[PDB]
Amino acid sequence: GMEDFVRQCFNPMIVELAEKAMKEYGEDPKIETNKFASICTHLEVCFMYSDFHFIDERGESTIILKHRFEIIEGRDRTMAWTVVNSICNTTGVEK
Amino acid sequence: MERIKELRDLMSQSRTREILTKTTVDHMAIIKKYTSGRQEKNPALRMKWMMAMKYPITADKRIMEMIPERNEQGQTLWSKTNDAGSDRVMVSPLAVTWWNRNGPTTSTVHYPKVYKTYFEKVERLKHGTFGPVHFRNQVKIRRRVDINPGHADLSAKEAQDVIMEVVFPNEVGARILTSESQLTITKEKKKELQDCKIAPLMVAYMLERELVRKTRFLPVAGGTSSVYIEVLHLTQGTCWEQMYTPGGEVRNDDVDQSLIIAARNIVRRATVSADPLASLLEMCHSTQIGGVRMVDILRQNPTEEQAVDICKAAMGLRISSSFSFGGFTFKRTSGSSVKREEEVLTGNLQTLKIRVHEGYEEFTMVGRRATAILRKATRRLIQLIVSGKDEQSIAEAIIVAMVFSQEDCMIKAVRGDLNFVNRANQRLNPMHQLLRHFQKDAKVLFQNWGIEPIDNVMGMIGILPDMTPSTEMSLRGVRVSKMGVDEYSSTERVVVSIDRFLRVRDQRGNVLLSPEEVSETQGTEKLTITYSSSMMWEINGPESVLVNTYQWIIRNWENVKIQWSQDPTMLYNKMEFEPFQSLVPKAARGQYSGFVRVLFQQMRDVLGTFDTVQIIKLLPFAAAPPEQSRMQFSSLTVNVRGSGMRIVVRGNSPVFNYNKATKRLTVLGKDAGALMEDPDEGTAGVESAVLRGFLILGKENKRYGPALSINELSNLAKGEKANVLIGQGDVVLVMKR
Amino acid sequence: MDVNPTLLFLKVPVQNAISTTFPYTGDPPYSHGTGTGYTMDTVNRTHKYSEKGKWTTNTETGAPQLNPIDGPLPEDNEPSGYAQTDCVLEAMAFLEESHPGIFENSCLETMEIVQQTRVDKLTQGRQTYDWTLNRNQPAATALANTIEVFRSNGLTANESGRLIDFLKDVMDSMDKEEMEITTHFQIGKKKQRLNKRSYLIRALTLNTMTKDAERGKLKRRAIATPGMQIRGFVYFVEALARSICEKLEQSGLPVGGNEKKAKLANVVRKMMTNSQDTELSFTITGDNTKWNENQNPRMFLAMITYITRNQPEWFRNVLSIAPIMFSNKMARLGKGYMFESKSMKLRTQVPAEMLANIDLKYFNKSTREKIEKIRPLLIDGTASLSPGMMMGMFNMLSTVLGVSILNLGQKKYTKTTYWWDGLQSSDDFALIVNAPNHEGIQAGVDRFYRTCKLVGINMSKKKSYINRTGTFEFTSFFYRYGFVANFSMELPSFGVSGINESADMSVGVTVIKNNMINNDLGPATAQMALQLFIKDYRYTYRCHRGDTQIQTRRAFELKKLWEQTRSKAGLLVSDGGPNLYNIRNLHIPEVCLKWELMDEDYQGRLCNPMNPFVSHKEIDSVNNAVVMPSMEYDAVATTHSWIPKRNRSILNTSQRGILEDEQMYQKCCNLFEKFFPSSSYRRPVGISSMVEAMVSRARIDARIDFESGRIKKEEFAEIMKICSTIEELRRQ
RNA sequence: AGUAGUAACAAGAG
RNA sequence: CCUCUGAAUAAACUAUU
RNA sequence: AUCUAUAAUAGUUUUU
Ligand SMILES: *O[C@H]1[C@@H](O)[C@H](n2cnc3c(N)ncnc32)O[C@@H]1COP(=O)(O)OP(=O)(O)OP(=O)(O)OC[C@H]1O[C@@H](n2c[n+](C)c3c(=O)[nH]c(N)nc32)[C@H](O)[C@@H]1O
Ligand SMILES: [Mg+2]
């Protein structure tokens, strides 16, 4: 019954991202329903954390340009690690 | 900008959009191999068929804009017909040879850098030195050698990770280069490849050719180094050996390994001599390692090994009473030991032999990043003090000390699927296997080692099986300190005296090294070893020694037979049998000698019984000082590659087998030659050189009752005939002299 | 004086001249027509070996099935497949007893392999029976078609990229009431609907054909090709079997070449040393008659069940599926037959789907008997073949079974004065038997024979023999106190490979070198082999020396190049140059060998990256650094690394449109390499679609470049706009 | 006719 | 008459890349 | 001292 609520509550984009994340490692959304909801909640929290932020030319965060946050969740591990490696190379931050 | 525009253009179309949308990255690999089918089953026949066609080759459409449709004589070079399943056109080999003679010229100056390995092969061949060709009895052994040396301290996966990091920084995924060697090599290659202008894929392939190590099983003789394996077809043959030295630079580790092997062989063969010191000196002066005289290497090479130290002491050079184990330099300050072969049962239900050293001893261990003082007894670690840099170094030192102690707790801690044989069923060193097993993960070892309260003396910190600094209880016998280094004195070569029997002594007069302390392992050399003497097989491996000893006996059978008949005392003292005597187990040598000699005496007392094969088989065993006894031997053992191979007194054996149909002798599968029949051979089916005090009369005789074992022949008396179960399932009637 | 070569064996031992007994200089035999006769013979013979078994009807497919397990014990020496389950279980149990922990560690390693393996592993291989087309297709093509059909039928677990998810898809498809596929004709697309039983029959079907170019056989034989559904399960089972075999000394697999010879020699010498010095030792060179037609899938199921005890249930199920699918297998009959009318002088093709209800007046006596015997087993154009392993499958599991029977020979199990050990490789074996006297040898041989009979293994009496230990034959290796060289076996490798000029030169020289190293090819014979190879090379590629007058279409260009060149030795043999190879430099590439002898202009023309005979990259505009093409036996690419044409038969069929598709695929793949440079070097792994990954990479690269100052803000804005446009196109 | 040998070729298709 | 076309089994190993 | 990394291509071995 949890799956119906999850599909009816969150927007289709987050549902697609969570379903893809589970399918990546063999998880079955229909069998594992609590994990489905947990992933959807985590993705929604991350997207709400990142969205509605921008950096002006000066370099100070602002709300309403370029995004202040780069999102790493919601991607397959390959693209996530590609983004992490590119950021580390271009900034020198610890990996 | 071009990439995104092209992606948008493809996505505009329907079929391309469907392919790009329905296909994941995983299925991209599947569709990449997608094809209508490569209907080729006989490439050679197909090539012969196609070369008769007008236009068998395929070329890009650009060729139509670069090469004329016809040459001077009007011969067509290409046509406009496309290749099915593509857009390339058909062309003739005339086009290729026209381009090679009239095409635009470029600058091919960086090719030697891209293909540095092959030009390095060319340079090594160019500057090589050729010696003479020697015809001999080659004994090639199937072993794992290296065909691509790659980098010294790297593996395949590490090399691939380094290549990815250097060439594809953003495609490395989650890997992090943790090993010091990987990081150093990555930095060095990035510095070298800084501001490179070659395509990334070709740079990756270059780094693969340079760094990745490749090994294969091959039948080898001589050296197993990469430089000596590339020209293996030239230097070694079925019956000949070509002396050759590569023209490049030689690695130091290979020289050290070859020197260790040569020193061990020389010392082992010298121990069995009547004057070991002179024999050792001459052997050292008559030996070369990779084209370099051994004495030069002994002068300019700082190797810590027992046999090398004995050679140096014989040459009057200062030595170090140190050896290597687990990456640490051990040095016995006090105590003494004797080696003993002990059978043990492994934790994972495996039975194996180990060379246990008895007695109490004290050592100092020095490592690149750790140091310790150890005190141990027979299979018992009395105490260890470690003063490493960080937790990892101390843990490694502790593991090495635990394995070095030969503790039963250590043996019983073996878990998982640990094997003590090679993938080709060749024995491995038990200690090295234990070290490799426990270095990956020593949690069980530490858990089963034990704990003990400490006395809190001098402030030296403790250590727990979890590798933490405790102060109340610590690992049994192990302590952690900080002020213990004593590393300068390790490299303190001391002047020593060497006895006639190769017993190295200090200036004070204490014994430091003796031949008994040299390893009994029979390894192979990285660089080819050349020996110049009457017997070029004097310091060879066991199989070569056996085959050449029997071949020498066969070749000189005339004078050897005369000498055996007339003056046996001088025959047994030939210098040719000493390499063979080195293979016989020491504790048995005298015994065997005695036995064999008695047989020969009987063979001379009873006329008409002169079997050439028996004398040839048993002659090498009579070269040791005899020890009288009444024991009966049905076979005599010889140590070959760590296994005791038996030679049966009567009949053929796996080692020594004689074939009467061809009158040929085979030793370990190698043809030692054909015996020449003598008129004095006894053609009566009587054997007098099988039993110590008995004469074999004939086949089974049921008159004298059932047969009895060989060891139960001591109950008979003079003139009593009996049936004996002597031989491989054979019963024969014999009588007692 | 009549010349009798065989009499040479009166002085040279047969092994030392064994190479003379291989007539491998003539062409090998081939099969001409159909393979239906051989397939029918194989099916009938397999059922005859199990005739006394239990007949049942499969409730899912309806096909008759024969079960010989736990059948009557044989009363004679004819081949039989009445294996006893308890005996097989006991053999496995004693094998576990002798090597504690073998099955546990094997299962651990196999669990890791199963959890890690990717679906692309199935693209390996040459051909595969495609159930959507009822014929063979390239493995990658078959996998692509199956994935497409599954996606069209709502089976998309394979998107995960794991092989086990593909197996889940196969299992779920088994339960579908219907399946829908697409078919091509004269090149339209039509839809076909398969009911549950038809699809199930297709999924359990293995195609059959006749093997060509096999040495040493007077008569032809049949071979099989598995379908798409069963490849993954067989792969996992064989991974488990390989793990088990790696831990056994008697196993002759999966080692080969010099390592295999060394292992066999070490094992044999260890057996010899363990033998007492007062007991007879004999060696049996043996063969097993119809090994694969007597081994039953049910016994393999039992062995797997015993091996995977105390393991997670999912692992046991995924391993057990393969024997389950193999005991319900079907066999395709083949092409059919051909009929001829002499009076009317005409010929016709009769397909194998008509054999069910075709009048038998056309066929001769033998074929008529075959068809009559096999008709009861025919269903949906195939034949029901429950017993037996078809052809060359489960080799390592068979090796495990043979090694277990060998392990049963220890004294702790024989409980008498004789014992045995030896070497096993699939179905070939060498057996060393030790006993105090000859009667002990006889008793040991008889006990080994009967124990093999109990587990359904028949020792070929007419092809097996026994002698004293010291000489034998095993897997075509002749041991005479040590393995001997056999040059004739590798002789067909000498010649011209047929790749291209550079690769063929490299292959020829490397083959000569390797045979010097391995097969005891002497120096003088090596030089003569080099001369013969260069002659064949020149004749094949029309590249005779420029200073000759051989008439060929290529001679004029070579003559001009020869005349215009100053350094002749620098020219390649492909360009009419001389031969500089000898023994000492067989290990060096030809171009590198004579690099320091080439004229600058000729050298530049030869190694010119912009040569249309080798493709060009697209980085920047074109990678104009080195000639770049799959570079096997071709160290340095030159203008002589061209690629020959392709077979154009498909152009006359309905599948020719597929060409377009593959071309288009390449197009897309090319674009993907402009975003992820490492894809060509290393295989990319991911679940996102290609377009999504490319767009994400473009966005991240644009951000990184803009932050680092590599590009200006106008380019960043344009790239973001185009990315948004692509996102819009994705939905529409 | 011939190749060949347990089934085919002695051109096939559009 | 004319157009097109000259035919890729499984496992393991070996060699090269 | 140990030494089964992947993928492509060709060759060899595995019959009542
Ligand atoms: O390649 C082989 C060998 O040549 C090489 N090697 C040896 N020494 C060096 C140095 N100094 N530099 C570079 N390479 C070197 O390492 C390989 C060793 O092969 P192998 O012959 O199998 O090993 P070895 O037979 O020497 O036995 P090993 O286990 O390595 O022991 C080394 C050394 O330690 C002695 N030892 C062990 N134990 C438990 C001892 C003990 O309890 N008490 C005493 N007094 N000595 C002990 C071994 O006997 C050797 O002396
Ligand atoms: Mg056989």
XYZ file of C-alpha atoms in Angstrom, chain B residues 194-489:
296
model
C 53.230 17.161 -19.611
C 52.019 19.160 -22.619
C 51.804 16.025 -24.759
C 50.324 16.293 -28.259
C 49.494 12.629 -28.987
C 45.986 11.212 -29.019
C 44.835 9.954 -25.589
C 44.021 6.435 -26.803
C 47.468 5.939 -28.331
C 49.066 7.342 -25.174
C 47.080 4.765 -23.205
C 48.349 1.978 -25.457
C 51.927 3.276 -25.148
C 51.660 3.267 -21.363
C 50.204 -0.248 -21.536
C 53.190 -1.418 -23.578
C 55.549 0.279 -21.121
C 54.049 -0.550 -17.714
C 51.898 -3.705 -17.819
C 53.694 -6.930 -16.868
C 52.922 -10.070 -18.890
C 54.034 -13.594 -17.984
C 53.686 -16.971 -19.685
C 54.641 -20.612 -19.201
C 57.480 -21.625 -21.526
C 60.116 -24.383 -21.746
C 63.197 -22.407 -20.754
C 66.895 -23.012 -20.250
C 69.347 -20.401 -19.016
C 67.981 -17.089 -17.789
C 64.330 -16.201 -17.237
C 64.719 -12.419 -17.533
C 62.700 -10.560 -20.155
C 65.816 -9.635 -22.137
C 66.877 -13.300 -22.187
C 63.381 -14.551 -23.090
C 62.933 -12.339 -26.167
C 65.889 -14.110 -27.822
C 65.117 -17.538 -26.374
C 64.719 -18.939 -29.897
C 68.303 -17.860 -30.665
C 70.186 -18.774 -27.486
C 68.776 -22.204 -26.562
C 68.153 -25.267 -28.709
C 67.420 -28.955 -28.366
C 71.133 -29.824 -28.476
C 73.055 -26.519 -28.556
C 73.557 -23.360 -26.515
C 74.538 -20.030 -28.068
C 76.382 -17.632 -25.774
C 74.834 -14.177 -26.096
C 74.606 -11.054 -23.933
C 71.966 -8.363 -24.597
C 73.360 -4.940 -25.404
C 71.221 -2.837 -23.056
C 71.432 -2.068 -19.352
C 70.957 -4.825 -16.769
C 68.707 -4.445 -13.732
C 70.324 -4.757 -10.313
C 67.687 -7.062 -8.811
C 68.249 -9.599 -11.595
C 71.993 -9.511 -10.915
C 71.367 -10.045 -7.199
C 69.059 -13.008 -7.829
C 71.483 -14.611 -10.288
C 74.389 -14.100 -7.884
C 72.425 -15.724 -5.056
C 71.582 -18.739 -7.220
C 75.169 -19.121 -8.424
C 76.613 -18.785 -4.920
C 74.196 -21.367 -3.523
C 75.045 -23.859 -6.267
C 78.794 -23.299 -5.884
C 78.725 -23.691 -2.101
C 76.564 -26.814 -2.260
C 78.896 -28.465 -4.767
C 81.976 -27.359 -2.806
C 80.828 -28.874 0.498
C 81.110 -32.391 -0.973
C 84.715 -31.802 -2.076
C 87.805 -32.957 -0.201
C 89.179 -29.381 -0.104
C 86.068 -27.176 -0.175
C 87.879 -23.822 -0.034
C 90.050 -24.295 -3.130
C 87.130 -25.763 -5.071
C 84.943 -22.801 -4.119
C 87.634 -20.311 -5.138
C 88.208 -21.901 -8.544
C 84.474 -22.229 -9.207
C 83.977 -18.551 -8.368
C 86.856 -17.619 -10.680
C 85.425 -19.771 -13.511
C 81.860 -18.381 -13.453
C 80.158 -15.487 -15.243
C 76.698 -14.017 -14.646
C 75.257 -12.282 -17.696
C 78.656 -11.891 -19.344
C 80.279 -10.336 -16.248
C 82.895 -12.181 -14.212
C 81.499 -13.297 -10.868
C 84.390 -11.784 -8.898
C 83.587 -8.269 -10.129
C 79.985 -8.650 -8.956
C 81.129 -10.056 -5.614
C 83.307 -6.957 -5.258
C 80.723 -4.333 -6.259
C 77.408 -5.888 -5.124
C 76.007 -5.398 -1.554
C 73.860 -8.535 -1.256
C 72.910 -9.987 2.142
C 72.774 -13.767 1.740
C 74.588 -16.663 3.377
C 76.162 -18.183 0.259
C 77.205 -14.783 -1.096
C 78.798 -14.023 2.272
C 80.692 -17.326 2.186
C 81.990 -16.523 -1.299
C 83.055 -13.033 -0.205
C 84.815 -14.411 2.877
C 86.635 -16.910 0.668
C 87.715 -13.952 -1.485
C 88.775 -11.943 1.580
C 86.037 -9.306 1.352
C 84.168 -7.916 4.338
C 80.704 -9.403 4.810
C 77.488 -8.796 6.729
C 76.026 -11.645 8.789
C 72.550 -10.666 7.617
C 69.786 -12.162 5.495
C 66.391 -11.085 4.161
C 62.911 -12.226 5.182
C 59.519 -10.679 4.497
C 61.155 -7.449 3.361
C 63.195 -7.063 6.564
C 66.942 -7.473 7.088
C 67.503 -10.006 9.867
C 70.839 -10.226 11.676
C 71.494 -12.871 14.338
C 73.267 -11.192 17.245
C 73.369 -14.320 19.424
C 72.381 -17.975 19.477
C 72.558 -20.853 17.027
C 70.188 -23.254 15.299
C 69.926 -26.444 13.259
C 67.454 -26.982 10.432
C 64.918 -29.796 10.735
C 62.126 -30.876 8.390
C 58.902 -31.057 10.418
C 55.454 -31.994 9.140
C 52.595 -29.754 10.273
C 48.841 -29.548 9.745
C 47.524 -26.226 8.483
C 44.514 -24.413 9.890
C 42.562 -25.131 6.693
C 43.320 -28.886 6.828
C 46.534 -28.974 4.797
C 49.613 -31.051 5.630
C 52.999 -29.618 4.688
C 56.676 -29.735 5.606
C 58.501 -26.781 7.155
C 62.178 -26.117 7.863
C 62.055 -25.480 11.604
C 65.152 -23.934 13.185
C 65.788 -25.162 16.722
C 67.659 -23.449 19.541
C 67.430 -20.005 21.103
C 68.361 -16.955 19.050
C 68.198 -13.161 19.049
C 67.834 -11.016 15.928
C 67.488 -7.375 14.935
C 65.050 -6.559 12.127
C 65.552 -3.455 9.974
C 62.944 -2.261 7.496
C 62.466 0.686 5.179
C 59.791 2.023 7.545
C 60.068 -0.186 10.651
C 62.604 -1.664 13.047
C 62.462 -4.287 15.766
C 64.388 -6.550 18.119
C 63.311 -10.195 18.275
C 64.159 -13.046 20.641
C 62.871 -16.527 19.842
C 63.284 -20.223 20.567
C 62.260 -23.387 18.707
C 58.799 -22.548 17.328
C 58.375 -20.040 20.159
C 58.470 -16.231 20.121
C 60.064 -15.185 23.408
C 59.686 -11.451 22.848
C 59.445 -8.754 20.196
C 59.994 -4.997 20.466
C 58.761 -2.878 17.546
C 59.397 0.836 16.947
C 57.732 1.465 13.604
C 56.648 4.789 12.163
C 52.851 4.418 12.178
C 50.237 1.735 12.851
C 50.608 0.085 9.435
C 54.382 -0.331 9.722
C 54.145 -1.814 13.216
C 51.382 -4.179 12.096
C 53.479 -5.373 9.152
C 56.505 -5.883 11.404
C 54.371 -7.800 13.911
C 53.006 -10.073 11.179
C 56.495 -10.737 9.814
C 57.797 -11.547 13.299
C 54.846 -13.853 14.020
C 55.341 -15.804 10.795
C 59.104 -15.886 11.397
C 58.572 -17.475 14.825
C 56.973 -20.612 13.309
C 54.379 -20.603 16.086
C 51.691 -23.279 16.057
C 49.132 -20.549 16.741
C 50.238 -18.919 13.484
C 49.897 -22.171 11.528
C 46.434 -22.898 12.930
C 45.284 -19.370 11.997
C 45.323 -20.217 8.274
C 41.811 -19.894 6.831
C 40.130 -19.757 3.447
C 41.322 -21.487 0.285
C 45.083 -21.125 0.680
C 47.161 -23.379 -1.575
C 50.785 -24.457 -1.149
C 51.292 -25.605 -4.756
C 51.574 -23.699 -8.008
C 48.839 -23.757 -10.640
C 51.142 -26.237 -12.425
C 51.482 -28.356 -9.250
C 54.976 -27.062 -8.417
C 55.799 -26.694 -4.736
C 55.824 -23.214 -3.197
C 57.724 -21.950 -0.176
C 55.415 -22.420 2.848
C 56.766 -19.349 4.647
C 56.213 -17.060 1.658
C 52.669 -18.384 1.246
C 51.960 -17.789 4.937
C 53.362 -14.259 4.702
C 51.265 -13.440 1.638
C 48.143 -14.886 3.270
C 48.547 -13.012 6.557
C 49.562 -9.720 4.932
C 46.190 -9.438 3.180
C 44.309 -9.855 6.472
C 45.695 -10.876 9.875
C 42.528 -10.446 11.957
C 42.269 -14.158 12.759
C 46.017 -14.366 13.409
C 45.879 -11.529 15.939
C 42.679 -12.866 17.511
C 44.190 -16.322 18.058
C 47.674 -15.098 19.022
C 46.669 -14.336 22.617
C 46.779 -11.494 25.115
C 48.769 -10.888 28.280
C 49.019 -8.122 30.905
C 52.089 -5.904 30.677
C 54.307 -4.484 33.413
C 54.376 -0.865 32.149
C 58.171 -0.577 32.039
C 60.064 2.368 30.498
C 56.842 3.837 29.078
C 56.899 1.564 26.025
C 53.345 1.441 24.708
C 51.230 -1.676 24.274
C 49.275 -3.068 21.345
C 46.064 -5.085 21.076
C 44.801 -7.601 18.482
C 42.693 -4.716 17.173
C 45.926 -2.725 16.615
C 45.376 -0.052 19.259
C 47.766 1.385 21.881
C 46.698 -0.274 25.131
C 48.535 0.112 28.438
C 47.206 -2.760 30.607
C 47.270 -5.794 28.289
C 48.970 -6.379 24.952
C 49.717 -9.102 22.431
C 51.675 -11.962 23.976
C 55.375 -11.117 23.952
C 54.998 -7.978 21.802
C 55.884 -4.457 22.933
C 55.910 -1.084 21.168
C 58.726 1.393 21.838
C 60.038 4.566 20.184
C 63.802 4.908 20.832
C 64.925 1.614 19.280
C 66.620 2.170 15.920
C 70.240 0.930 15.888
C 70.142 1.132 12.093
C 73.563 2.602 11.271
C 75.368 -0.450 12.672
